[PDB]
């Protein structure tokens, strides 16, 4: 009956350097129920073959998942994470910022 909205962080595995191969992560946490849709985007387009961690949860029973894929940041390409959950009226998009 109680539903909790996901927190979202989108970030790289290593500090980004343009042209250097890396991993793009979207960490979604603090949500309930566990059913969630997470997509990684490149220039607004869904990236295929994204993998994710095995579902687990925190002390307050809220769930967390890590979605990830290889990527190579560039100056102009934009990366983002798009999340849908029962608590959201519309999908939530968080843009990747290399210093966050």
């Amino acid at each position: 009956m109680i539903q909790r909205t996901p927190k979202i962080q989108v970030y790289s595995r290593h500090p980004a350097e343009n042209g250097k191969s890396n991993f793009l992560n979207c960490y979604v946490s603090g949500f309930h129920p566990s059913d969630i849709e997470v997509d990684l985007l490149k220039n607004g387009e869904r990236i295929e073959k994204v993998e994710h961690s095995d579902l687990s949860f925190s002390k307050d029973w809220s769930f967390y998942l890590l979605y990830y894929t290889e990527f190579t940041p560039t100056e102009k390409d934009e990366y983002a994470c798009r999340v849908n959950h029962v608590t959201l009226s519309q999908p939530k998009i968080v843009k990747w910022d290399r210093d966050m």
Binding site: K7, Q9, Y11, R13, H14, N25, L66, M100
Partner: peptide
């Protein structure tokens, strides 16, 4: 303060 997050290689990050 952001929540401590996994890097995906077994280590963690925070800022």
């Amino acid at each position: 303060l952001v929540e401590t997050r996994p890097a995906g290689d077994g280590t963690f990050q925070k800022w």
